[PDB]
Amino acid sequence: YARPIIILGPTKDRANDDLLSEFPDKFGSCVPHTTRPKREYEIDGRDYHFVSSREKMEKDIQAHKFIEAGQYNSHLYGTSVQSVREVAEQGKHCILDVSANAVRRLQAAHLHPIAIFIRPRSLENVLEINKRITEEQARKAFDRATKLEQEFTECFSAIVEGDSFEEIYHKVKRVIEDLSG
């Protein structure tokens, strides 16, 4: 059984993507649900689990079957507990792009998430670990990270810091190896 992964804080998307691309044997993505209709080249159970009834998915959301659920363009989307479990049971760490609220939900489902928060040391440090954004965007990312830590600190398996994304990525990989015992 492989513990699912939730990385949070600035650069988490880049970390998620890189783990998936670098170690395809170790990490995988689970299959999400949506109520939107299936399109060409899409396969039920691979791209999405396609739900025929919006009423069904709402009931399931209310029954706590989803660790993360939302809507876009008139349709429902979500990441089910069972989909994560299916990845974990195949021996792969499920890389989850989800909010910190999904951590307590995975714990309550006894899936043992490894929740890693990437903490910016300062506004200055955000522009060190993310080279794609402006100072005022970094300010907004910094305020978000501050609020996330204030709220979710108890949920974190570990907090990582660094002066570059490369260093942070290195620490992230090390945390996952250590917590995979």
């Binding site: 999400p32 659920a69 939302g70 876009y72 429902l76 792009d97 909010s99």
Partner: peptide, 15 residues
């Protein structure tokens, strides 16, 4: 962040 996947966009309106 242009042409963000729809699943990732759905995170912006969460329940």
């Amino acid at each position: 962040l242009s042409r963000v996947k729809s699943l990732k966009k759905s995170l912006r309106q969460s329940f």
